[PDB]
Structures are given as structure tokens and as C-alpha cells.
């Protein structure tokens, strides 16, 4: 399964199976036991703008 969204860089370590914070507590939820992989990369060149 593939779920996709964009977050900030200073909060990606809120994403681990068993965590805290408003993207772990609210807005999304992992289980505690986990199989898959998580991949993230900055897109400030394209997704940020003046």
C-alpha cells in the first residue's frame, strides 16, 4: 500500500511506528509493529514558491 502526502522537513522523525506529535497523534497513524518502508525527499525547488 502506497499513501502519499507532503510535510515539512523538521518533523519527519515524528514518523516511526510508535511515535508522538500532531502528525502521529492526529492527521495520520502508524501501528507499532511495521513491515514497510518510508521514503521522503525535499521538494522546495518545485513545491515552494515566492
Amino acid at each position, epitope marked *: 500500500y502506497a499513501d502519499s502526502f507532503v510535510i515539512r522537513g523538521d518533523e519527519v522523525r515524528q514518523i516511526a511506528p510508535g511515535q508522538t506529535g500532531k502528525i502521529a*497523534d492526529y492527521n495520520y497513524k502508524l501501528p507499532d509493529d511495521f513491515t514497510g518502508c518510508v521514503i521522503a525527499w525535499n521538494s522546495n525547488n518545485l513545491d515552494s514558491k515566492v
Partner: antibody
Amino acid sequence: EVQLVESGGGLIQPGGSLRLSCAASGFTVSSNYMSWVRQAPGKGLEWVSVIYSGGSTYYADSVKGRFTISRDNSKNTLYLQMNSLRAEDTAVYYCARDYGDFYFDYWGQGTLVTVSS
Amino acid sequence: EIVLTQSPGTLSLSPGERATLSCRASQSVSSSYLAWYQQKPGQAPRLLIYGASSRATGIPDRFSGSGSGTDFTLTISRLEPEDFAVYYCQQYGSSPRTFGQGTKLEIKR
């Protein structure tokens, strides 16, 4: 929206433990964040701890492993249980209603935490 | 680094004139994620303005905060004498919420 009375603090010898209480009124105390902030009597304002409406808590690094917050939304009473008291945690403390961005918009009255001496 | 540092630290003036002050960080902050506070001595400290843009209710409009990044100011358009207190800057951009040390506002009778 009249709320946030504080009580409980005072003279206490070091090494003890104390649960403070900040009761509010006219507000759904469950469905928001609250916080704690200290005020050293010669110095500025320093944040202590936060709770979430879901219920997650965070603390300052100095008070790590020492201080436990809790609440009873059946009686609308925040509980700051501080333990292993040292003689530099001698500030006056404030319960603070919290919004959103973690602005502390509504403020308590204050109560003195004074270490044994 | 995130440390709020007041510009002057105190101001002694005469009422009826435009008051202006700033608070300086120790790095550039993410955009306008800071606030101001005032403290009445012997009382509870109170809200001043969120986001350095607009202030909340219960506050009149004689006051204006501006700036971006390291510098971030606050301007009171006319000195009300009863507003003499200790005034704080507060941030919420960084992962802790750090504070400053305050600014004293008074008059020289």
C-alpha cells in the same frame, strides 16, 4: 470565559513531592491544550510542560523524569505533580490555556513554589 | 540558534507619543511564528499580538508589530500612560518555545 484559578503551592522541604491544581470554569477543558510556565522572581518566563487534547504530554529537559502532569475532565482540574524537588525550582508557576500555534492566551493567577529553607 | 534578545531593555518616556520597540532573535526564524506579551507587576501576564501581524480581541488598536526574520518590532502609535508595564517577546517557531527578558516602559515625571 472566567477561569483558571490556581492553588496548592508554598513551603516544602526538598526531596518531597507536590501535586498542584489549576481549576478552570466555563470551558471544555478536555478539548484543548493546556500548559505550565514558570516565572523566576528575578528572571523571565520559562515554559514547563504541555498536554494535548488527545492527551499527549511533553516537558522541559531539566524537569525530565521528575514531573508528571495530569487532569480530571470530570472535575475540570489540571494536576501538576512535581517530584524529587530541587532547590532551584523555586519559581512562581502559571497554568495557561493554550491555543493552536501554542499561544498561551488565557492565564492563571499564580502560586508560589518555595523549596525548604 | 533561538534566543530572544531585547533591543534596549527599558524605556522611560512621556505619554501621548509614538512608542516603538523590537526584539532580536539569534537566528532568522520561520515566517512570523512569534508573539508579544506584557506583564503587569503583581498581576498575570496577558496576550499582546499573535503572529506579529494582528492582535486578538480585548486589545484596542494603538499597537502594531512588524519585522521579518531576526528583527521583529512592535510599535505603539501613541503612549497611553496606563499601559506602562514590562513587555515580552515570545516565539513559537522553534521546537522549544523560548522567551526573552522583557522591556520596561514608564515615564519621567
